């Protein structure tokens, strides 16, 4: 997939543990802590639910057909 | 079968967690939001669900939750003990 990061912004590719690689990748690529931040997707309710596992990540997988992952970061 | 789990703090929510369910139903239930959820630890919160008027109602074992499941959403609250 096509990442769309939102800081509450970044375009990377992603190639699918991945929640981690995928948490890391956002963590090296904003210079500004790992483990202080919290990832999210938006629903089909249109609230903001944070994942931080593979089991997660993958809901997440569903509920973003957009052809783009877009992710909202709050630090 | 897929249950979002409302995290409380300050009536109002704070982290939403979504997940899909199906060793009793009410400990695999709790044991999934104790590992989901950073902020919380097995045994330090309570789980609730909206009743038919929507009011808030807690619940704590298996005979409890098939019964609370009657009402393809599961949308659970949780208040930090």
Redesign the interface.
């Known amino acids: 997939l096509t990442v769309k990061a939102y800081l509450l912004i970044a375009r990377f590719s992603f190639s699918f543990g991945p929640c981690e690689r995928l948490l890391s990748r956002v963590a090296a690529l904003f210079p500004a802590r790992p483990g202080g931040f ?1 990832a999210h997707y938006r ?1 089909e309710d249109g ?7 593979d ?2 990540l993958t ?1 997440a997988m569903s509920y973003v057909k957009d052809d783009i992952f877009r992710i909202y970061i709050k630090e």
């Not at 609230?47 to 596992?53: K, T």
């Open positions: 919290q629903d609230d903001l639910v944070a994942f931080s596992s089991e997660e809901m």
